[PDB]
Structure 1
Amino acid sequence: RLITATENGNQLMQQNIKVKNWLERALQSERNIKEQIAVLKGSLLLSRILYQQQQTLPSADELENMTNRIADLRL
């Protein structure tokens, strides 16, 4: 059980590191998009930039809910 818990904790740490990197990238992209919208409002390239940002935005639907895992770990 301890070995399984250690493996699960390592996997959770890797997932948390990936999620933190994704969140930092998303925050940077949001700041860049806000700056671009404030600076180049009314420009044709603004639509292309927004489309590229939306395409590059990650999908959170692949992130499963961690409430059940947290409850099981607490128990």
Structure 2
Amino acid sequence: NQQLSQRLITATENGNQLMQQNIKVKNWLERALQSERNIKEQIAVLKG
């Protein structure tokens, strides 16, 4: 039971770290998607 509890605690900590990293990645990815759409629109009209 103690080993199971320790494993669950470690897994929960790893899950929290992974969730934080995933949230940061999602924020960066949304920013990148917006920037890429903006760049495509600009290049559609920023010729020469």
For normalisation by structure 2, the TM-score amounts to 0.82
Q: Give CA-to-partner distance per residue, 1:7-58, whole Å, 9 cap, x none.
A: 000000001101111110110010010011001111xxxxxxxxxxxxxxxx
Partner-residue secondary structure (3-state), 2:44: helix
In terms of Rg, which structure is larger? 2
Cα RMSD over matched residues? 0.6
Identical aligned pairs, as a percentage? 100
Partner-residue secondary structure (3-state), 2:36: helix
Aligned counterparts of 2:40 and 2:27: Cα–Cα separation in 1:
20
Unaligned runs of 5+ in 1: 43-75
Aligned counterparts of 1:41 and 1:27: Cα–Cα separation in 2:
21
Structure 1 moving runs of 4+ over 4 Å: none
Say how many residue pairs are matched.
42
Instruction: Return the match for 1:30 from 18, 21, 36.
Output: 36
